[PDB]
Amino acid sequence: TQNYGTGRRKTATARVFLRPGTGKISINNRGLDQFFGRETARMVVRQPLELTETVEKFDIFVTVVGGGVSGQAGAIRHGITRALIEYDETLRSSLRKAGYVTRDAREVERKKVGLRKARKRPQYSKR
Amino acid sequence: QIRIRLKAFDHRLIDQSTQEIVETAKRTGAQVRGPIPLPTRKERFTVLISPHVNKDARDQYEIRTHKRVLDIVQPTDKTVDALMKLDLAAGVEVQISLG
Amino acid sequence: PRRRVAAKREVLADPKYGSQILAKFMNHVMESGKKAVAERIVYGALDKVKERGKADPLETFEKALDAIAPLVEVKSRRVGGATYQVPVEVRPSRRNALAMRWLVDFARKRGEKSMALRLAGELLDAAEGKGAAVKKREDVHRMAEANKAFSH
Amino acid sequence: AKESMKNRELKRQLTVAKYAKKRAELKAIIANPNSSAEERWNAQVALQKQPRDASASRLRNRCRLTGRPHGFYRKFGLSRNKLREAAMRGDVPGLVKASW
Amino acid sequence: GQKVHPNGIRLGIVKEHTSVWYADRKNYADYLFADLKVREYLQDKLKSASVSRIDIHRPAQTARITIHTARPGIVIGKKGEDVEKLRQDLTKQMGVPVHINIEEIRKPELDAMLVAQSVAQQLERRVMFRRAMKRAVQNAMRIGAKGIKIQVSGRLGGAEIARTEWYREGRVPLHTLRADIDYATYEAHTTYGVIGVKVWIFKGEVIG
Amino acid sequence: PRSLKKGPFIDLHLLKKVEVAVEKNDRKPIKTWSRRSMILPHMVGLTIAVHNGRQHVPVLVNEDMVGHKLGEFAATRTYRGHA
RNA sequence: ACCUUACCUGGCCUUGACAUGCUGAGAACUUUCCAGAGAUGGAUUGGUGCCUUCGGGAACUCAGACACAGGUGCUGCAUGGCUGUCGUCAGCUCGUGUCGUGAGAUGUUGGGUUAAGUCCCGUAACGAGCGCAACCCUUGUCCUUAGUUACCAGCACCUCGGGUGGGCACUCUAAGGAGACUGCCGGUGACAAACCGGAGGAAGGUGGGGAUGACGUCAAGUCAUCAUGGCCCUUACGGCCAGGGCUACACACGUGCUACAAUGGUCGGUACAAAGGGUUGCCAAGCCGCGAGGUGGAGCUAAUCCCAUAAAACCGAUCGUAGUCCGGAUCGCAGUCUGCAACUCGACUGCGUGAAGUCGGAAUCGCUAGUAAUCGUGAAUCAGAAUGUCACGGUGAAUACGUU
């Protein structure tokens, strides 16, 4: 039984396990509301479930580590999508059009020598 | 029971040393718990290159330290010591534990 | 740019109204990366809108947006001695962006207690054509139609 | 990088290493929790009797090749613009240009 | 424009470090200082012997010095009365005991450092730099030496103004990281000032 | 301020001179360079010439300037005014 | 702060703080003394040492005589080396041939195309070189190898802690590989180079970022990092010491930091990082103080222990537009720590005071996506001293019709 997905987002990673169940959801062994408190993180972590309309049928066990709250939510979504793909591997198109299977490669640009930030410069008075 | 810790400034020769220790241990009939690559240590420096005032003209350098771990089970022949001139040859720091 | 290579991004995720336009409005009211604060401000303003009366707050929102997007815009151009100001029709995408920018900027400077109250007042007043934003729109329209000679 | 500068920093290092332990117990006596005021005073006067140019705080480490007070690195012993010369030739083991 | 040291940027790719040992924070600086001092001393004493590469290895509490030279007979003469004296001396400098072996460099004229040695010596002997640089390029390119470049900068001759003159032959790709460019710099201390000599030599590409 | 672990800080030679100067009462100033030394409560009523960087300035010590240091009564910069 | 240190005031040495050469006399050291601001000088219990061809000698110490040493003194327009700048701009040349009496030209011009002198097609030019691109590091997906100090899917116990037995599934760490090549399809195109779209894929059109700086330019910067030609001082332009200065202050300019508040200030409750440093070191648990901190000594030569609590964000309560529960400068009092020593002239802590400041004239700067904006963390230098420098993550926008 079960299915395993590995999601990754913004220096954060997530291990997700899908089993037969009734949508229990548990992240780091605590409830979804206790983890993502009143924001769109619930929406983003649930998106593939309702798009595939299998929110009620799967029991989910998640362990996430690294990054910030939004990055962790993105990791959960990515892992969930990959595990859902491997479960019933015929709806790759359905997620593909939604852009969930693609892994976002954006990362924090490094600081450069002589500059303040990665791109900001000092003021440049010419006189 | 004995454990080996290996330290070097580059990966080629540390890999060679791990391979030779492992193959000697396999030949001598003992068991080996697989080599473990410990995370490398990277220490960086940023140095000015002009002899005088040019602050934005810098140049960056780095030193990496690579660490490997071996350990053996069921030992009866002790010639890993006997290769004291050969297990470490040029630039490998080797630490032995549970001798 | 010269190369004409810019590609538009797709990040648009209204959580609990499922309305595509409110996410962009919250992006406009956001300052310094604090999505949650702007989120709260907009939702509080919409709660005030829905509790003043019977109108659907979202519907009042797009009614105000329609009643505030300009139709024509004035573009300056120096002709060799004087800078004239031609009129030109506004692209469909630029209308909503201009509308939101004006609405937020004018709600910034009203002077009630909280920013949510300022925004709610602006939506109520501009929903029939009485706010500062609507009269700015009228100023732009008259300025554009007073230069109809060039137009082309 | 006068030769006199290097000579007198060498003198300072020799003389600070000369005692190097009397200072230790004298500081221990002064900072001891329960040591009586008289022992505190005797330790203070004895420690102040020592030559002024004998404390570790007066040592300003310099380039061991040129004696440049500035741009010193303690991982190596070299200053700013001898380290680059040594590192370009490949003399310094482990040092390479890095980008990350 | 200012270039980058070709030996420096090719470390870990085609080139190798002169000193190969591992140390920790206890004694890294001591070993580095010892290596620099012994290299300076060895290059200072036996200049007559044409020595270019001096590699240092440090196994546990021991040192091995390998010297690249074009005159094995001079350093090791009539059974080597000098190699043993040098061994005791270098053991006096270094803390650890020292082991020495001499590895001669075939084709001395193909080594960049030796070419720089010769050009600087000729410029000391008031030889016209025209002829010296031409002959160096010719002797190098006659055998092997798939590319070469020589540059001489300073008060050439005795002119009361300093210029740079350089001669090139073959192909010398400096922006290619696979090229095993051998580079050398040296100073000639003449009667009017210093003259700098730079030599690039390109052997060929490396794959695998 | 110095910690209270060691109450005062006083130089050995200056302290010795001060303690000598009480057998016969205040008659002559004590010449010194030690600006770092704090005035003790029991050298009041005696005159000390402290170094300045060019000469020694004489200071007559009274009870109200006890907890300070000698260098606090010798200005090392002049600044007679821009205008 | 002293030292750095190169400057000033005063005290003091002349083969000298340092090198070699000569001679004579002795070991080095250890002695808890006195005078002096110190430099220094005079006293000073102890063994006068080692190797002996027993003729003496080595190292080390002291005194004399000269050759000398010494100089952060001048010249960067006498130089080497190193660096900025145009500019990461796409250019700069050469060999042979040909054209012109010659300087020169051709190649390198022309139609397209490209990030590109990138490529195709023509062409009295045929080739080559340095540049461009590739090779290099890192990040984005997958596979093998390995599972400790890292991990916990399945099993057993569990004080309910990966804590234990154990597992090689996973995350992760680090070596080797696969992958992306306009590869496949449609259309345009001189059925060429190439361009516009599409499918598949983690990634699509040099995927993102970095290192990489052509011939030369500015007699650009550096003689003070170093090296060095010539000139200059040698009872001082050399050397040693103690105080002071580099921190001055009617003013003007450059770069930042903190604010002028309600997308905010205080109090309580709670969640999630990356990277890095530690044996002349980090410095816990317990205890004592409102606090900086003090005692204590566990663990760690470190994926093990320590630095070490991330903050903004979320929830609750209060303030209700006031020079204020905003802002924090300034000053008074009392302390802690480092250090021989915090007066000139250190960093922090407590109590009190509470300034200018209501979004800033003419003018002017940065930024095109994980970017700007904003929030915190670490290291180098370092006894102590960062609003600077160099790195690291969290949240996360607006806009680009177009080249007038």
Ligand SMILES: [Mg+2]
């Ligand atoms: Mg990064």
Ligand SMILES: [Mg+2]
């Ligand atoms: Mg300006």
Ligand SMILES: [Mg+2]
């Ligand atoms: Mg010198």
Ligand SMILES: [Mg+2]
């Ligand atoms: Mg210091």
Ligand SMILES: [Mg+2]
């Ligand atoms: Mg010059």
Ligand SMILES: [Mg+2]
């Ligand atoms: Mg110049």
Ligand SMILES: [Mg+2]
């Ligand atoms: Mg020059």
Ligand SMILES: [Mg+2]
């Ligand atoms: Mg050209």
Ligand SMILES: [Mg+2]
């Ligand atoms: Mg030509």
Ligand SMILES: [Mg+2]
């Ligand atoms: Mg020609």
Ligand SMILES: [Mg+2]
């Ligand atoms: Mg002709």
Ligand SMILES: [Mg+2]
């Ligand atoms: Mg031409």
Ligand SMILES: [Mg+2]
């Ligand atoms: Mg063309």
Ligand SMILES: [Mg+2]
């Ligand atoms: Mg080309």
Ligand SMILES: [Mg+2]
């Ligand atoms: Mg696709």
Ligand SMILES: [Mg+2]
């Ligand atoms: Mg496509």
